[PDB]
Write a protein that binds this ligand. Sequence first.
Ligand SMILES: [Mg+2]
Ligand SMILES: [Mg+2]
Ligand SMILES: [Mg+2]
Ligand SMILES: [Mg+2]
Lengths: 154, 95, 123, 76, 243
Amino acid sequence: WTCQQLRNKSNEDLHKLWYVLLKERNMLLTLEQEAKRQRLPMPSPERLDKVVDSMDALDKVVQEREDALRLLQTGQERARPGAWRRDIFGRIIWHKFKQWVIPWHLNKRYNRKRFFALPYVDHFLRLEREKRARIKARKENLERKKAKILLKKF
Amino acid sequence: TVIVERWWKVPLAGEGRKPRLHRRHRVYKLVEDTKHRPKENLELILTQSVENVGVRGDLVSVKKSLGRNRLLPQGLAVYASPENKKLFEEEKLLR
Amino acid sequence: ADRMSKWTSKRGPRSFRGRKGRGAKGIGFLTSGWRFVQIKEMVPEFVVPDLTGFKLKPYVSYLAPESEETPLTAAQLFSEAVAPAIEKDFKDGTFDPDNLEKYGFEPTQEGKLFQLYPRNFLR
Amino acid sequence: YEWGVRSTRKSEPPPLDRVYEIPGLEPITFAGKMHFVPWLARPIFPPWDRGYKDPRFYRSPPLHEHPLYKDQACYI
Amino acid sequence: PLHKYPVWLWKRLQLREGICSRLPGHYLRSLEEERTPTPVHYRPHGAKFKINPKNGQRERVEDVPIPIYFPPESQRGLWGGEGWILGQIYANNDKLSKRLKKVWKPQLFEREFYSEILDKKFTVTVTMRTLDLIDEAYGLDFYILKTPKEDLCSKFGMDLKRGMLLRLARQDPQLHPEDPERRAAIYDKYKEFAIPEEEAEWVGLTLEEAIEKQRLLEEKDPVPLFKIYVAELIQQLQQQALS
RNA sequence: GCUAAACCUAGCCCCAAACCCACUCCACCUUACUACCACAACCUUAGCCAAACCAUUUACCCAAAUAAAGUAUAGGCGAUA
RNA sequence: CCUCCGCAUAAGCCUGCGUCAGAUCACUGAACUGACAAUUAACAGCCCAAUAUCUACAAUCAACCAACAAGUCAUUA
Ligand SMILES: [Mg+2]
Ligand SMILES: [Mg+2]
Ligand SMILES: [Mg+2]
Ligand SMILES: [Mg+2]
């Protein structure tokens, strides 16, 4: 199935098709394993790939619909809430939130976490940056050098 | 406060340079301790007929102790600023 | 004296082997005398449709003609859901900048059973 | 001689930030980013109530608040 | 390899792209300025030049400050700029003797003050220097308002300043709600310090605090796209109608 | 005649130019990579070494290359700075 | 002919003499390589609503006797 084909299909019908694809997958997966056991070639192994792709497509189509509707209703790009935070290693991370019963200030385990970098980290950040730069610089050079030899041969 | 001077001279920096300092430049010599220098009086104007210091509108020099701890807290006296000094001359001239 | 292998529930002493698990989502809680209480509601329920008289099959005929790929966005969704209603009501005087909730918009997600952000449903 | 040594008891909470005293302004606290940082001020949180009842996490009334509480002491 | 900009510039350079870029102009300028504090622990050279008694040649001089350490307790009080001096000494004021580590700490006193603008009693840890500066300025309010950031050397000093300046800016009626004329008197006494409200918001704020404040102001719940598209659609329809 | 030998290209070095990456789903500060419950950071570098010992002392990045100039100056007035 | 060893749990280790095919002190094979299998909870781990309130008298066949170093185990509203 193509993504386009599935987009034309109804919302409810996609849900039904999805179980049709589920049962098909499981058949082919058991068939893979049985060939492996008998030490024999599979009949048509490529089928599995097709099936997988179809379901990937389906999931994507559905995902799109949800995403679209979120934008129209809340204007939120991400389904799950989160924040940019600064870990103890002084690097910037996208921290995903979890659900809790109690509010954050009352959470003992959560308060144990350090979402900030003390000063000693800054020097390491320097060294890290410098390292990244080196690797990059090396890459650039090799690109140029390669072009040069490719000019002398042609 | 404590006032110190260095044992070692620091080389000149020029106009737009911050001076270069050394491990030797950290050695100090004690000039003076400010707390040991003799006592001075604090100038005040009294707002009330306070005992054995004066009466309302009197320019009085009193110890920092008496001033900061008795006179100023209770509003018995005020700072002898130029702004309020003239004001106390004015109320006198109204007589 | 191994650091490189993945740490697992197989690996510790007795207490350790109890505490860690695989990924499985828990479905209840424990009470006195290590009695496990299952909650029916914590257990996911498979919402599985009726497949009778259904024409779609898991593979597609090659005889089908090809079409250009175009993904879904909010703009076009609004154009083919809300826009016709709005413009039709713009022709008369029924349309209103206030109470546009009639067209399907909601001010808040709080009351809803299926809340869009944050998401409160499985898949 | 009172019982329970000082070290064992719950520590007296640290003295309040001096910014709070000044009547003009409200402090900048780390309430906004939902975690502790050392440089911003400690927020004061309103006391929390779980709206719904949960049996496992239940707190009983104070002793005066119980319906059967009596000034006259019975001995059992 | 080489970094493009010297490493010492990075602090400055980072103020230009992020949340610090969209901070107010006046705050960034107050952050940038690098003026020296008044001497506290060293007698400065009076003149720009001085004759050497050694050779009898007139020579330039510079004033080199002693480095001052301020323990975090100093932020919770008003020290006139006195800090801990950590240095070395020679044993009997002879350079040929043993070198030793010395720390000079200022004497501290817990004292009570009344702020006229804030109409509040405070109890703070101070030095004799501070008490002397207050006397010369003719009141706590004057001392707080006159003294720049550098010389105050106190987060709490700056917070006092922020409050007072905010009160002057707002002409706050809660100074004396029951006595309006006394409020008028207190205001006109400190009228020369008065600055705009929106400028008074940011005085005496550290960069971390500042960026929290700015982040709080700029953060908003994002608008639903329903409103955007409905607004624009009726616009297209409006122009369509006027044809 | 065995064991061998032989190879050119992965890449790398120093410059110049230019201010850098922080990233599908899930998980990860508790025994990290584990869905799910009432403390807090800022605080003089020292020493080897040189002085033919060692004890005061002994260059170390601070924001324009050159020159002023190893000059003025400092220093167990010595090493040296 | 030998056995002061064995079987089990714990602690530690992590598929490390199961099956099949090639392959190489000793088999041209196996404790080698590759592919395929397997260890099923009743044992064991993983626990407990709150605030007050209670808890003087060992163990030793606990009986007689006998001590000293003075002791692992309870609630009620
Ligand atoms: Mg020059
Ligand atoms: Mg030597
Ligand atoms: Mg030698
Ligand atoms: Mg059991």
